[model samples]
Target: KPTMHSLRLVIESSPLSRAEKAAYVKSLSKCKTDQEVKAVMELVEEDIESLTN
Candidate 1:
């Protein structure tokens, strides 16, 4: 689905390092629902902030 594709795009377009992006993308396979994916994304945002700080 484009929904998942779009989510991956967001990660790819982010400032996170390539390794971080790869880790997040790989974890996507373990996410069982949209909420879980969003939760991981929230974590990703927090991670990005930490990197930027």
Candidate 2:
């Protein structure tokens, strides 16, 4: 199971720019439900793929 701490670390270590990492981490605080967290994760993954591909 993905915890908030681990999710934040994943974003921090991603290829995203510094601003993007900060923004994404900040967004995590807005997630109160697992679905919301999953949504943010999906969005971040999309952003990662966009940058990498």
Candidate 3:
């Protein structure tokens, strides 16, 4: 289970803008389980990393 702190760190450390981070977080919140959140978060991270780098 990712705590708010961990989630915030993940979002903040990404190359996304604050609005994008917030949107991602909102999508994550729709997930029913920690695994779902992790899956979506990973996708977002990968996409952000790819675009930024």
Candidate 4:
């Protein structure tokens, strides 16, 4: 039950770089629920993995 602001803060303070953090924020903006946020985060993680690897 994370709020948008809380989610934003979490993403912003994450280990991700600025670009990845921004993407996470954007994904969270489109999320309707915590589950949706989690799902989008999985996608973001994949992108991060690909970018870093």
The numbered model that scores best in lDDT is 2
Q: Residues 30-49, candidate 1, lDDT per residue (tens digit)?
A: 78867778888788788878
Candidate 2: where are CA atoms >4 Å away? none
Candidate 4 per-residue C-alpha lDDT over 1-53 given as tens digits, one digit per residue, 9 for 90 to 100: 75667756755654687776775677678877677778876886686567668
Tens digits of lDDT, candidate 3, 24-44: 778876877777777886888
How many residue pairs clash in model 3? 0
Error of 3 at 44 (Å): 2.5
TM-score of each: 0.75, 0.80, 0.60, 0.52
Clash counts for all predictions: 0, 0, 0, 0
lDDT of 4: 0.69
Winner of 2 and 4 under TM-score: 2
Computed on alpha carbons, the lDDT of every model, listed in order, comes to: 0.80, 0.83, 0.75, 0.69
Candidates 1 and 3, the one with greater lDDT: 1
Candidate 1: the clashing residue pairs are none
Give the lowest summed-lDDT range of ten residues in model 1. 1-10
